Swiss-Prot record:
This is Insulin receptor subunit beta. It comes from Homo sapiens. Residues 1-65 form the Fibronectin type-III domain. The gene is INSR. The lineage of its organism: Eukaryota, Metazoa, Chordata, Craniata, Vertebrata. Glycans are attached at residues 38, 51.
Length: 67
């Protein structure tokens, strides 16, 4: 599996578990219907041995369709 830890600046952390089947199907992850803003993502692969280091933060901006 993988864990996706996203957070829109100021808010609290949101999460998502992406399983193998889920990952191979979706070609990664897909985040559906987030309120607008600049989000910060870290990703962490969990293998048979343990939880391996979080990917440095990436930023993604969901459009405001107003402002
Ligand atoms: C999204 O946010 C990135 C990181 O923001 C940085 O840290 C915060 C706490 C503020 O100090 C901010 O001014 C810093 O830039 C930005 O570097 C990035 O450009 C932003 N992304 C978009 C799409 O606007």
């Amino acid at each position: 599996l993988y864990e996706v830890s996203y957070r829109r600046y100021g808010d609290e952390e949101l999460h998502l578990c992406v399983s193998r089947k889920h990952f191979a199907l979706e070609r990664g992850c897909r985040l559906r219907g987030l309120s607008p803003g600049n989000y910060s993502v870290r990703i962490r692969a969990t293998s048979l041995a343990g939880n391996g280091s979080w990917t440095e933060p990436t930023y993604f901006y969901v459009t405001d369709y107003l402002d």
